[model samples]
Target: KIKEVIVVEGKDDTAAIRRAVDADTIETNGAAVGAEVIERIKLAKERRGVIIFTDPDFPGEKIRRTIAEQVPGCKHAFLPREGVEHASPDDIRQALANVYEE
Candidate 1:
């Protein structure tokens, strides 16, 4: 299992993550994540850590920015737009493997 919790935009994203690795995840549910969700992410960030792995879309970028602003030091994993459109597990895995902090 990974040390950091994986932050995803939805259940489908979580499924992609499962296909790639054994890890915990916090789903934002969508681009407009509520404060409760952000708080949970904050807790996860403190307790373990967090990785922002949203899809390569406008909504995804919004979610990523929200989380990054509210919860500092989160790692970011990005998949290509084409790969995200296909929901490719390989791309997700590679992104997770090569996550970066910002």
Candidate 2:
């Protein structure tokens, strides 16, 4: 299992992530992220670190936008192609394998 947690836009994204790698995930549950969610992500950060994996066709930015501002620090995995649902396992693996922090 990966040491860090991954944050995605939906459960579908989680499916692909789980298929491609072994890491826990926290879904934004449709981008209307609330304090509870962000709080959990904060815990994920302190406990195991975390990554914000934005998809190509979702409002992934808003979630991260708020979260990034409120949280101390967060990792990011930008999708170069389709979203997790439409992407291949190999590419997803590579995407998470190469995370960013900017």
Candidate 3:
């Protein structure tokens, strides 16, 4: 199981998170995750904390927006992008693991 909750588009997104953070997962299963998903994410963040690991694509951005728009207190961690110029979970983490280091 995953350590904490990671919000993603589908199983593939979940797999990425498993490779990166080794955290628990909750699938939006795509854009279809409506108000209920928002409510669940809010509550989950309130209780156990959450990290949104969406894909580095338009759909992923949409999902991230949906969640952030609904829940303001949750912490958002994204991937650190390489020279590709797109910010993704990998990019986010690379920055976290590098620039933020002491």
Q: Name the top lDDT candidate.
A: 1
Q: Report, for every candidate in turn, its global Cα lDDT versus the true structure.
A: 0.82, 0.81, 0.64
User: Which parts of model 3 have CA positions greater than 4 angstroms off?
Assistant: 1-3, 83-102
Assess every candidate by TM-score.
0.88, 0.88, 0.70
For candidate 3, give the lDDT of residue 84: 16
- Model 1 Cα lDDT, one tens digit per residue, 1-102: 889998988777787778877889998877888999989989999899999888767888888998999898899989854524346678877887788655
Model 3: lDDT to the true structure: 0.64
lDDT of 3 by residue, 40-88 (tens): 8877887886667676678878888888778875555556553112345
Which is superior by TM-score, 1 or 3?
A: 1
lDDT of 2 by residue, 4-91 (tens): 8988888888998888888899988887888899899999999999888866554767777877788778898877653666668888
Show where candidate 1 strays beyond 4 Å.
Answer: 80-86
